[PDB]
Amino acid sequence: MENQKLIANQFNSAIGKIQDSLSSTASALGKLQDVVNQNAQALNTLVKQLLVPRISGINASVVNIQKEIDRLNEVAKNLNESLIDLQELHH
Amino acid sequence: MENQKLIANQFNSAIGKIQDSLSSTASALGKLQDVVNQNAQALNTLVKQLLVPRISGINASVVNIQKEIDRLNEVAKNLNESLIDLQELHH
Amino acid sequence: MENQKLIANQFNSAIGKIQDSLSSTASALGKLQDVVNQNAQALNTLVKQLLVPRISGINASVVNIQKEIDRLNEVAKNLNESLIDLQELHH
């Protein structure tokens, strides 16, 4: 094929794979954020239940990486605008 | 150098760096998954050991992002198929 | 525009978005590492405070993914060296 079509097709192929990787990274980060926060709640509930009638300074922290997860999903979508339209490679 | 060789070389350079980043992301996610699950087990063991003879509703969750980690490693490898073979830029 | 300029501009656009995604991934991983380790410390402090005068084998693990986070930030920066300089597309 024409050199420019080989280049454009290989680029578009790579972008599609990178798009998949961004969605996978965002999904994994969201699941980690959910479990970390659930387990922080469990630990804080344990401290409270040990203290309430039928260790006071111990507090589990929560995580919020939602802006980062949303950005990854945004980039995965907007990379469509960086794909090369082969019909625009004039001849 | 020829314009197409500059483009192809810069593309191939970027893909190699992105490949490294995918492997690093997958490694980091795996280590987080391991520690999160180890600490969930530790918390659940604490609740159990406080209750067994020498807080019942408290349960730490586990995380499984293995499909996402495997996909990142898969993309890092398969991006090799998106590299531009310079020998195929005919003259 | 010229086909090579379309290709080079689309490539440079994609790299910039991928750079943003790497910085976001590194930021999210750092926040998860911080909270996971803070909550490991909280759990270990709980075990200790239950045992000290006014469950011994229970120990929360810590995570260290700093090499991976640093690599992601390094790639996000060094991808600048993979951008195509349009002034070098001679005519």
Numbering used by the authors:
A (entry chain A), B (entry chain A), C (entry chain A): 917 to 970, 1169 to 1205
Show passages lifted from the paper.
The spike (S) protein, which is likely to be cleaved into S1 and S2, is responsible for the two processes. The fusion is mediated by a 6-helix bundle fusion core constituted by the characteristic element called heptad repeats (HRs), HR1 and HR2 in S2. In this study, we solved the crystal structure of fusion core of HCoV-19, and screened a panel of peptides that may potently inhibit virus infection.
Recombinant proteins of fusion core, which consists HR1 and HR2 linked with a peptide linker, were expressed in E. coli cells and set up for crystal screening. The HR1 folds into a long α-helix while HR2 exhibits an extended structure from I1169 to Q1180 and folds into a canonical α-helical structure for the rest part. HR2 interacts with HR1 in an antiparallel manner. A trimeric structure of typical coiled-coil could be observed by simple symmetry operations with each HR1/HR2 complex in a crystallographic asymmetric unit.
